[PDB]
Enzyme design. Structure first.
Site, PDB file in Angstrom:
ATOM      1  N   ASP A   1       0.869  -1.055  -0.029  1.00  0.00           N
ATOM      2  CA  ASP A   1       0.042  -0.043   0.172  1.00  0.00           C
ATOM      3  C   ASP A   1       0.839   1.171   0.180  1.00  0.00           C
ATOM      4  OD1 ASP A   1      -2.077   1.679  -0.086  1.00  0.00           O
ATOM      5  OD2 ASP A   1      -2.675   1.311   2.058  1.00  0.00           O
TER       6      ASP A   1
ATOM      7  N   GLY B   1      -8.854   9.794   6.597  1.00  0.00           N
ATOM      8  CA  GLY B   1      -8.392  10.779   6.538  1.00  0.00           C
ATOM      9  C   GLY B   1      -7.049  11.174   6.724  1.00  0.00           C
TER      10      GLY B   1
ATOM     11  N   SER C   1      -5.123   8.387   5.774  1.00  0.00           N
ATOM     12  CA  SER C   1      -4.738   7.617   4.716  1.00  0.00           C
ATOM     13  C   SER C   1      -3.585   8.045   3.989  1.00  0.00           C
ATOM     14  CB  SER C   1      -5.870   7.463   3.817  1.00  0.00           C
ATOM     15  OG  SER C   1      -6.801   6.475   4.170  1.00  0.00           O
ATOM     16  N   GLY C   2      -2.575   7.473   3.780  1.00  0.00           N
ATOM     17  CA  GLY C   2      -1.166   7.873   2.949  1.00  0.00           C
ATOM     18  C   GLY C   2      -0.370   8.765   3.707  1.00  0.00           C
TER      19      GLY C   2
HETATM   20  C1  LIG Z   1     -10.269  -0.266   3.094  1.00  0.00           C
HETATM   21  C2  LIG Z   1      -9.475   0.898   2.604  1.00  0.00           C
HETATM   22  C3  LIG Z   1      -9.176   1.188   1.047  1.00  0.00           C
HETATM   23  C4  LIG Z   1      -9.395   2.195   3.506  1.00  0.00           C
HETATM   24  C5  LIG Z   1      -9.125   1.588   4.932  1.00  0.00           C
HETATM   25  N1  LIG Z   1     -10.144   1.293   5.529  1.00  0.00           N
HETATM   26  C6  LIG Z   1     -10.065   0.831   6.843  1.00  0.00           C
HETATM   27  O1  LIG Z   1      -8.975   1.180   7.694  1.00  0.00           O
HETATM   28  C7  LIG Z   1     -11.360   0.303   7.666  1.00  0.00           C
HETATM   29  O2  LIG Z   1     -12.468   0.293   6.784  1.00  0.00           O
HETATM   30  C8  LIG Z   1     -11.105  -1.256   8.051  1.00  0.00           C
HETATM   31  C9  LIG Z   1     -12.252  -1.797   9.048  1.00  0.00           C
HETATM   32  O3  LIG Z   1     -12.228  -2.824   9.432  1.00  0.00           O
HETATM   33  O4  LIG Z   1     -12.681  -1.033   9.752  1.00  0.00           O
HETATM   34  C10 LIG Z   1      -8.773   3.031   5.710  1.00  0.00           C
HETATM   35  O5  LIG Z   1      -9.680   4.073   5.892  1.00  0.00           O
HETATM   36  N2  LIG Z   1      -7.702   3.415   5.811  1.00  0.00           N
HETATM   37  C11 LIG Z   1      -6.915   4.728   6.065  1.00  0.00           C
HETATM   38  C12 LIG Z   1      -6.804   4.963   8.026  1.00  0.00           C
HETATM   39  C13 LIG Z   1      -6.636   3.867   8.556  1.00  0.00           C
HETATM   40  C14 LIG Z   1      -6.654   3.921  10.013  1.00  0.00           C
HETATM   41  N3  LIG Z   1      -7.119   3.128  11.101  1.00  0.00           N
HETATM   42  C15 LIG Z   1      -6.711   2.664  12.223  1.00  0.00           C
HETATM   43  N4  LIG Z   1      -5.423   2.942  12.499  1.00  0.00           N
HETATM   44  N5  LIG Z   1      -7.562   2.099  13.131  1.00  0.00           N
END
Ligand SMILES: CC(C)C[C@H](NC(=O)[C@@H](O)CC(=O)O)C(=O)NCCCCNC(N)=[NH2+]
Ligand SMILES: [Ca+2]
Ligand SMILES: [Cl-]
Ligand SMILES: [Cl-]
Ligand SMILES: [Cl-]
Length: 223
Positions: free
Chosen positions: A84, A175, A177-178
């Site tokens: 990722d 938010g 993310s990345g």
């Molecule tokens: C599915 C991909 C494409 C996006 C990702 N999704 C998730 O993390 C959640 O939907 C997974 C979940 O089981 O809640 C996301 O939003 N990631 C960015 C931030 C993740 C941070 N989460 C933490 N640290 N608990």
């Protein structure tokens, strides 16, 4: 960021906001012309925004630059989020200053127990929704690979690591993310995924950047 603190204006000068009409992902400036983000942040119409604190207020240190090229990892798997990581070339080079600065790539992987700075404009609530306009910061340790895989059986690759608190209350969220995970002046992590946010025994999962340093340098040198 859940359970963090206001970073303070331009205190994370390597933090970028990816904007497609609105902030949708964070990213890390690795030189004047290149950003590292997550592959799951991939989309067209990306403007890279540097020198940002309040993403809803023009405070005067901003640089807004269009992506010319996005390179998602050759082995990125969207079903599993393995590999990722994505590179973004700017149409033009950023003017580097005190507020707009590059973060060094890792020479080596970090170990468990290493303290790290995680930052973003993501959700600040572990139940419901609140989005800050100012950059939020969290100090978080890298967790044992054993406790990471026990938290998420069958889902953790060698291209992933856990950071945060198994007790919950402190984490990245949607938010972020990345965005960056910086440990001893090195970018070791990219905000990738997690079950909910700041939940008990559900730590943040981060892309393991030390694994990608050859591919990053090689790709930048050829592009
Ligand atoms: C599915 C991909 C494409 C996006 C990702 N999704 C998730 O993390 C959640 O939907 C997974 C979940 O089981 O809640 C996301 O939003 N990631 C960015 C931030 C993740 C941070 N989460 C933490 N640290 N608990
Ligand atoms: Ca601003
Ligand atoms: Cl260097
Ligand atoms: Cl807060
Ligand atoms: Cl693997």
């Amino acid at each position: 960021i859940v359970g963090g603190y206001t970073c303070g204006a331009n205190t994370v000068p390597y933090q970028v906001s990816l904007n497609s009409g609105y902030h949708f992902c964070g990213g890390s400036l690795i030189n004047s012309q290149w950003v590292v983000s997550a592959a799951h942040c991939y989309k067209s119409g990306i403007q890279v925004r540097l020198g940002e604190d309040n993403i809803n207020v023009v405070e005067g240190n901003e640089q807004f630059i269009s992506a010319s090229k996005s390179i998602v990892h050759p082995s990125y798997n969207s079903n599993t989020l393995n590999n990722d990581i994505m590179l973004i070339k700017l149409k033009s080079a950023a003017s580097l200053n005190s507020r707009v600065a590059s973060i060094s790539l890792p020479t080596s992987c970090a170990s468990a127990g290493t303290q790290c700075l995680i930052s973003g404009w993501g959700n600040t609530k572990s139940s419901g929704t609140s989005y800050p306009d100012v950059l939020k910061c969290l100090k978080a340790p890298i967790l044992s690979d054993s406790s990471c895989k026990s938290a998420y059986p069958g889902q953790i690759t060698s291209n992933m690591f856990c950071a945060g608190y198994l007790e919950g209350g402190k984490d990245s969220c949607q938010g972020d993310s990345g965005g960056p995970v910086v440990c001893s002046g090195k970018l070791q992590g990219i905000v990738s995924w997690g079950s909910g946010c700041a939940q008990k025994n559900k730590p943040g999962v981060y892309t393991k950047v030390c694994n990608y340093v050859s591919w990053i340098k090689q790709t930048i040198a050829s592009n």
